Design an enzyme around this catalytic site. Sequence first.
Site, PDB file in Angstrom:
ATOM      1  N   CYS A 172       0.732  -1.248   0.000  1.00  0.00           N
ATOM      2  CA  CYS A 172       0.000   0.000   0.000  1.00  0.00           C
ATOM      3  C   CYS A 172       0.772   1.316   0.000  1.00  0.00           C
ATOM      4  O   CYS A 172       0.252   2.324  -0.460  1.00  0.00           O
ATOM      5  CB  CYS A 172      -1.045  -0.002   1.129  1.00  0.00           C
ATOM      6  SG  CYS A 172      -0.491   0.045   2.872  1.00  0.00           S
ATOM      7  N   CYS A 176      -2.016   3.645   1.206  1.00  0.00           N
ATOM      8  CA  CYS A 176      -1.687   4.084   2.567  1.00  0.00           C
ATOM      9  C   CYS A 176      -0.419   4.930   2.576  1.00  0.00           C
ATOM     10  O   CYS A 176       0.319   4.983   1.589  1.00  0.00           O
ATOM     11  CB  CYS A 176      -1.457   2.887   3.510  1.00  0.00           C
ATOM     12  SG  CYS A 176       0.084   1.979   3.166  1.00  0.00           S
TER      13      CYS A 176
END
Length: 247
Positions: free
Chosen positions: A75, A157
């Site tokens: 991520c 993320c």
Amino acid sequence: RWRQTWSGPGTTKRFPETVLARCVKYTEIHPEMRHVDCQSVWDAFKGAFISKHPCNITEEDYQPLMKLGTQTVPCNKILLWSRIKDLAHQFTQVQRDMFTLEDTLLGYLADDLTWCGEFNTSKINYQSCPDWRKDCSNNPVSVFWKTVSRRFAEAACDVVHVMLNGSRSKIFDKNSTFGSVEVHNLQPEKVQTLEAWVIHGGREDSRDLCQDPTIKELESIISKRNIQFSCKNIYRPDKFLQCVKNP
């Protein structure tokens, strides 16, 4: 015998054969994805739009494909891009620990392909397919992309990077997959920063493109969703790759 003629190009010739080969090649280059059964993949892909009116496709139609295509992308290594396809991909081709949507199995399968079916028929429509503007927005191709894109964005993320094209009238275009779905689906809980890389390209004399009205707007949208914004000018693209290619 009730096939309407649409305004967009028909399905890419050999679409089925192409998706299968691409799935096979992909799992061949990514051992971590060997568990994937390409026939199942194609079946789930086909099931999303075959025998269905090409103007009433929904995200759920693609869910079976989405599941069979589950993939773990680190991520914090995602590269989003807007209208700067080639450079975005030459980048992940070098910096292999970075990933764009088209680097995932699903994105790799559909990249640059067109497809659609016909209501109550098992035939792939090679004659013509719905154009999102002139015909309808909920066609097989569009629905597919806004779905996989949204899922890709949601999974990001930490620091997410977005490559943007500085040569464009609107470096940041609200009307684009990036501006209409990806930026609004990055999660504040997971993502702290959205860093843009504006790629220069002859449009004008060299200046700070990170002060561009559209960029300021991007920052507005992002900041509003509680995510920090950062922008960087990539003045010499050729020198860019080179330094990423031979650090």
